[PDB]
Design a protein around this nucleic acid. Structure first.
Ligand SMILES: [Ca+2]
Ligand SMILES: [Ca+2]
Ligand SMILES: [Ca+2]
Ligand SMILES: [Ca+2]
Ligand SMILES: [Zn+2]
Ligand SMILES: [Zn+2]
Lengths: 552, 352, 552, 352
DNA sequence: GATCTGGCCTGTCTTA
DNA sequence: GATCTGGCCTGTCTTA
DNA sequence: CACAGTGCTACAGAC
DNA sequence: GTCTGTAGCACTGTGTAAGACAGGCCAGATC
DNA sequence: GTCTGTAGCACTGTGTAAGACAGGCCAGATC
DNA sequence: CACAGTGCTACAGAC
């Protein structure tokens, strides 16, 4: 007989129906059994403008430095006023974004219901407790290749895209005192798509450091402006004050090196978090403390540029530990769970390949012998473990490959029974320490493996040192170093590793492709303006509650 | 007359970007300003350019020990300090814009240090500190050297910059304005700068050509951003160094040349040749122009252009710099699917 | 209220909703306003089994030779009993199919509303008119690359797919007698997806003639069995007799050569329809009669095998005109409109490239200057005509490129003002004859161009002979030859060319990808079995009428 | 002893398919039966195999003018007619299965015709007409040559075929059954065939090895499809050409060898070596077997196998043929992403 | 040691 | 004409 | 210890 | 007793290009 | 006068791998 | 002369 426009808007967004398809269905269900059940299109267009950024009134105290005080801006082009002179650097970019703090207050006003519920069940009252809210924001950015370009009108544009997004991890309160902070809301599925809100869209290559900084400059300026002020928002009838903590952790290592002034990526200086060289990280594999920070990189490139002690290129690089570019964006000193998984899996793949052939006796084989070993390994892993060979190592293959039964399917090919147990012991050692960096909370989920991590990694390193020395004499992969030397202090400083992974962002890339193909106007001038809005709607808690609450 | 010959970049395609510099030191030409931060293949960012056999080759140059290293500035003001006392012969750079788009506001002296052995050259850069009344961070401006009885100074004028820090918004972030039209006299040491305002220079300009000789500087066609016009008028400014304050007088001359972002290659003692930037926002200038200047004033005569290829004629943009001795290098963006990935076609044009 | 399960099944199928997404919506609309409007899932599973093949009872008179008399078979695996011994040829194939005549019965029974209304509008009555029905079936088949392979269990399978489908073009009646035949139904959009019904899917490469014939053998056997019998179907309450005419025209040139025993494809014998050599088609460009037929290719390869006159390899090859393989599938002697368009467009692209540089004066250019000309042409066609450069010529680019204004955008680059006139005249000559092979009915909607075709092609050929002889001295594109020599007699023999194009099949490939990603179980054993059924549902007239009728 | 060396196919890996034949004519080995119909690079379909320097090279052979051309049959029965009167020395082929999966039911005699010039050889194929009682179209069967008193005849036995045309259905289309177990005596002209039934040969078999010597033929391990068994028993068949009807007797010998689809390379006068097909449907045979046969009967002894590589040991399938003089060629399917596209790794095994 | 010829190799063309 | 050294080139590694 | 599906078949709960 | 809703099954897609570095060698310049 | 349904706009995706053939050259065999 | 959309903005028709 009648549905609420909000309900059917959630129906249309959460089921991936395009506007045209939804209209096709609405007219049909309206001509059979004439009484219209669904709402027409225009009332949904009117329904959603309360959910998009630029609707609620807010203010910062003190005011944000070099950020405008207008609170009703919606979709802006990220060029931010690029003067289009011909003698200047070209305006090669099509890019669009939400202005940061506006999108922040939108995503926060989205969580009104959950903030109030978390207030009421911990039995805190609300005339009280409107002073010390603290929001922890995980931000994330990643490039993306193979984006087919449209004919359109102009300008000529690359076939790659960059996608800056964020997500609200936790929101707590500290009033009145002694209490560390009483968490009132926390994300239950932080690595999901439904909790990764898009901010900025660009048709830019990751690699061109000139255009990427031009597009991302204002965003970082807003971030640096927000660390000081208090947001004030009418939530639950009352004006309340919010603080923000930003943690940039959704970056793969290539991006971290690009963004912190380090050289990428097979350098002599391997770690993003420490200063040890590649060779130095073979002799001692497990004893390194985290030293690098954004402020220190900033003050080190000043050493590189001024060269105050007048030394040569190599002596200066050693003095500065490889900071030859100016760091541009502060990045949290942590690890990426997903790409660490994939790297360690490709390393073990190579180790199995070098155990089918016995490259610990015959130190230099041909290329056709290595290809033949690859063939036999892939055939075995097709018979058992039911895997096809992959062009590139991806996450699912890494998950199914680093199991104990896959190693036992490999040992059937290793001839002599000492290396068999050798790498079997290796694999079970590795499995005793994987859950520490992929759990959402290791201290509660797998506490004993948290406790036993130092000793386990010690034995892993010594097994590598002893019976794989032919491979790790002076060479190690960066993720192996991170996995063996820095995990415990990371999880003791932050609390978790897997909760801050790059998984949600890569999961959102799928949605980017989907919506560009079926949920936007097919033009260069409008496609990003549509993808951004529909993506923002799809990741709204308020629209997602209509799906579950109206089932249970 | 003049001839153009198409070149081929053998392996260096990712290093040249629309705003770059070619510095002629002791006959050898050096490319300065590359795309991105300096990689480890060349941790200096400066390359030696060698054109032979129709190929364009780049070679990594190194610095000395006492030199300060240098960000790859994109559109800096560049002044060839000629060989004289005391130390010859530097190359003044100020100040361009950084890979992450900041404006430098620093002055760098770039000179040759030692050779060889095997045609190896080491350079050196001294970041010269400036005390003033220093000029603001800018780009697209110009810098020239002048001698008056017979003290040496540097005139600095023009340019664009970001909007003032009070009106700059994260929605005004990339918009630029022309800086106020003062002239800056930079002594090269001590690094005392002084600013002077002129009644006849009412508005700032950028991307103009400045030709200096013997205590007179001629500013040719620039671009005014307030009125969006490219003036055809010529500015001629005459300085004189009397201790202690440099009196300074100006004049507007009837007609000059309506260009922006040109290539001024030197062919003679004090005579250059202009290979052309842009006449209007949609129409790049295709004609050559000889410019010799003397004690009477500046002279101007049309030379015949080379037979421009169809590609370099129907291109939207172009850029380049003087390879010296009446020879220059021009670049054209290329379009293809897949990416070539050689981003630019190269030509070498030469006079006589 | 409540909708008829047929209505909501059409809603679910025609809007590309998943089953999971549809259930997600159904429970939601059923919890707010508890009165259930949509039907649950199981009743739709019950609703569709009347629409899939294997539901209605039929019979052939006389019985089909070596085809079983069972009428209730659904989806079979196309291996057709491949004995799986290890010494035999492997069972490398995953393939599914409908048994041909059963699917034919299903589509025909689907067309019963339109058959009855077509009877009533011609004012023909029904107790009459049950003996002389004639159905014309257009068949189509095409390979398809870039099909990612599943992990699954087995067996190892290629990453290409072949997709055999058909569509019912027209159906007419001949009794009483004198009338040629009174057409009662005819397809209004024959090149659409909604009227291209899938028959058989395989994970097979186009090229392996061994496995493709093994899969497609039974299908061709059923085809050859159906040409003699008469089908009998209770349509409109009465039992009626149908006969079938099969026209295989949805094949690109490569597949026609593969399936008629000809050598592919840059041969000395160029035409599929005639026997003229390549050089012979330079001298005489417009005067060739169609001579080749499946009967005669079969007759000729026996000449090749037995070699009854004891000649050498080349004398035998020219005695047999290039028939060295046994033809395996009868193919209608016609042309493919889409691929002809694309071929002639790429030829004109090369001509423009050879006119920017003046290769009629400098006969041997370098490689770098040819690349330079390519760059300038692509930049010009980006400034005007709003085109990006393409890796490969496709249909839309071909349509936008062969316009008057695009040639005029090219002439701005050609310096000599007589070659400009030359290729401008060339382009309008070409446009005066393209609608003859692109129209659904040329004699009705462009009759004067149909009658003026001989003379127009004459002048086109002579312009090539005179002002482009540097290019066409002894070499011609195959599609140029077909376009210049065989169009009139084809359109006179068949009636049209564009109506029988491969456009609809290629359009169905889009649906193949879509369904594989969103409408099937993710396993090797089941995905084809699901794509086939859902694809068959999506192309049903009966389900498509619920969309149109309940709007207007 | 025996050694295996890995080979490399230089530029032709797209032609070898599991069912193919290698014919040893005058010391030169010829590959017959390629994937697909004959391309224009080799319009005959027969290639000359040259192994050298660890490389496997294929050369396009041509025919004579009086020869009939030949479809690439896949699993034909192949009998080396040895050099004797009248014209040596043929190579009997019958009948295999066609690129489009028919069964040929035609007999082809393949001989050498002329040479050279530059190590060029031309062959010739006479398709020999058969009058009978001809045997039905089949494959996987075996053909052998026998001499008695002292006439020469050809024995033909075994094989699979498609189901009878009365029971064959478009859902039975690819299922195969064993032909009825009769032996066919083919005179080679008069091209008259006779069929004889035997009380002890109760069911048909396929993919067996047939070894002939001086009017006695020994059928080794085959595959029975009705009961799905690989019999260990050996069949010995004694023929004798009496004017004018060929009396013929049979016997079952106690134990033979349990194999299917083997490689019988000849090493001595009447002595061969078996390199192994498959023992069971899931387990390929890895051991060698020497089989010399004399007037007394068959003899059989274990030889030690070569050191099978891990790849050739863990492969699911394999195939190949004898390169002659105690040497044979084996192939292994390869799995990789992307496609290599070299479909098969090759080894050459050799005895002594 | 000189000459001949078959077959390999590269580049262009034609359809995808 | 012999010797030296800078810089080019190839292959392997590390992250995507 | 990613996660939201992919559709079909069984098998309970609910009147 | 029919109708209804969910658990089990096995697998999906988003994660995708250059740069660093060590060793060998050759070419060009000098003594 | 609010509500409703469609026309205009500019562009999308399905069309995607080897084989034929002519000319030059070299290697190996013969006189 | 492929064709079924892609979403937003205007602009008529309909009480
Ligand atoms: Ca990335
Ligand atoms: Ca990515
Ligand atoms: Ca095709
Ligand atoms: Ca296709
Ligand atoms: Zn470290
Ligand atoms: Zn023809």
């Amino acid at each position: 007989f009648g549905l609420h426009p909000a309900v059917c808007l959630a129906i249309r967004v959460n089921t991936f129906l395009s506007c045209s398809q939804y209209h096709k269905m609405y007219r049909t269900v309206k001509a059979t059994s004439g009484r219209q059940i669904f709402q027409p299109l225009h009332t949904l267009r009117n329904a959603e403008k309360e959910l998009l950024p630029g609707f609620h009134q807010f203010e910062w105290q003190p005011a944000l430095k070099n950020v405008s005080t207008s609170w009703d801006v919606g979709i802006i082009d990220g060029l931010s006023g690029w003067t289009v002179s011909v003698d200047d650097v070209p305006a090669d970019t099509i890019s669009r974004r939400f202005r940061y703090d506006v999108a922040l207050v939108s995503a926060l006003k989205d969580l009104e219901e959950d903030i109030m519920e978390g207030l009421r069940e911990r039995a805190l009252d609300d005339s009280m407790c409107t002073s010390g809210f603290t929001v922890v924001v995980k931000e994330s950015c990643d490039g993306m290749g193979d984006v087919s370009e449209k004919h359109g009108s102009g300008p000529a544009v690359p076939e790659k895209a960059v996608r800056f997004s964020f997500t609200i991890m936790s929101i707590s309160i500290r009033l009145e005192g002694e209490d560390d902070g009483i968490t009132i809301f926390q994300e239950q599925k932080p690595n999901s798509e439904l909790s990764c809100r898009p901010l900025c869209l660009m048709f830019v290559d990751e690699s061109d450091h000139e255009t990427l900084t031009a597009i991302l400059g204002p965003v970082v300026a807003e971030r640096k402006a927000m660390m000081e002020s208090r947001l004030i928002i009418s939530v639950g009838g009352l004006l309340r004050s919010f603080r923000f903590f930003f943690r940039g952790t959704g970056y793969d290592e290539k991006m971290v090196r690009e963004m912190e002034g380090l050289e990428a990526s097979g350098s002599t200086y391997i770690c993003t978090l420490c200063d040890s060289t590649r060779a130095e990280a073979s002799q001692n594999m497990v004893l390194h403390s985290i030293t690098r920070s954004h402020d220190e990189n900033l003050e080190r490139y000043e050493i590189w540029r001024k060269n105050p002690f007048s030394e040569s290129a190599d002596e200066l690089r050693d003095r500065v530990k490889g900071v030859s570019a100016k760091p541009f964006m502060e990045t949290q000193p942590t690890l990426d769970a997903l790409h660490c998984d994939i790297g360690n899996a490709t390393e073990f793949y190579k180790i199995f390949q070098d155990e089918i052939g016995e490259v610990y006796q015959k130190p230099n084989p041909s290329r056709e012998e290595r290809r033949r070993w690859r063939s036999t390994l892939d055939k075995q892993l097709r018979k058992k473990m039911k895997l096809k060979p992959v062009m590139r190592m991806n996450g699912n293959y890494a998950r199914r490959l680093m199991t104990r039964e896959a190693v036992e399917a490999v040992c059937e090919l290793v001839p002599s029974e000492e290396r068999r147990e050798a790498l079997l012991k290796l694999m079970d050692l590795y499995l005793q320490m994987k859950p520490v960096w992929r759990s959402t909370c290791p201290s509660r989920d797998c506490p004993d493996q948290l406790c036993q991590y130092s000793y386990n990694s010690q034995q892993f390193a010594d097994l590598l040192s002893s019976m794989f020395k032919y491979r790790y004499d002076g060479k190690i992969t960066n993720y192996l170093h991170k996995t063996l030397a820095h995990v415990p202090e990371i999880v003791e400083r932050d609390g978790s590793i897997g909760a801050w992974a790059s998984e949600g962002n890569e999961s959102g890339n799928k949605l980017f492709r989907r919506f560009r193909k079926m949920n936007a106007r097919q033009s260069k001038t409008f496609e990003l303006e549509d993808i951004l809005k529909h993506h923002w709607l799809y990741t709204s808690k308020y629209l997602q509650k209509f799906m579950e609450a109206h089932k249970n | 007359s003049m001839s153009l010959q198409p070149l081929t970049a053998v392996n260096c395609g990712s290093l040249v970007q629309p705003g770059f510099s070619l510095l002629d030191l002791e006959g050898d030409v050096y490319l300065f300003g590359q795309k991105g931060w300096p990689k480890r293949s060349c941790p200096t960012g400066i390359f030696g350019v060698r054109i032979k056999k129709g190929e364009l080759k780049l070679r990594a140059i190194s610095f000395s020990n006492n030199s300060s290293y240098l960000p790859p500035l994109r559109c800096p003001a560049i002044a060839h300090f000629e060989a004289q006392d005391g130390k010859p012969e530097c190359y003044l750079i100020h100040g361009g814009r950084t890979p992450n788009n900041e404006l430098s506001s620093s002055l760098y002296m770039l000179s040759v240090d030692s050779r060889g052995c095997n045609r190896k050259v080491t350079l050196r850069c001294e970041e010269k500190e400036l005390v003033g009344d220093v000029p603001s961070a800018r780009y697209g401006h110009t810098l020239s050297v002048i001698n008056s009885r017979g003290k040496t100074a540097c005139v600095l004028f023009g340019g664009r910059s970001y909007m003032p820090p009070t009106e700059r918004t994260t929605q005004n972030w990339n918009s630029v304005v022309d800086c106020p039209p003062q002239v800056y006299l930079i002594d090269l040491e001590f690094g005392c700068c002084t600013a002077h305002t002129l009644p006849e220079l009412t508005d700032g300009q950028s991307f103009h050509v400045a030709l200096a000789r013997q205590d007179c500087v001629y500013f040719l066609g620039g671009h005014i951003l307030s009125s969006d016009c490219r003036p055809s008028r010529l500015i001629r400014l005459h300085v004189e160094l009397l201790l202690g304050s440099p009196v300074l007088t100006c004049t507007i001359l009837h007609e000059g040349l309506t260009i922006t972002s040109a290539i001024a290659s030197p062919i003679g003692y004090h005579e250059y040749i202009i290979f052309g930037g842009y006449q209007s926002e949609t129409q790049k200038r295709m004609e050559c122009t000889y410019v010799g200047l003397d004690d009477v004033g500046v002279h101007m005569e049309s030379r015949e252009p080379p037979q421009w290829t169809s590609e370099i004629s129907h291109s939207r943009t172009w850029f380049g710099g003087s390879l010296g001795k009446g020879t220059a290098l021009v670049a054209i963006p290329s379009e293809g699917n897949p990416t070539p990935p050689e981003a630019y076609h190269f030509y070498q044009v030469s006079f006589q």
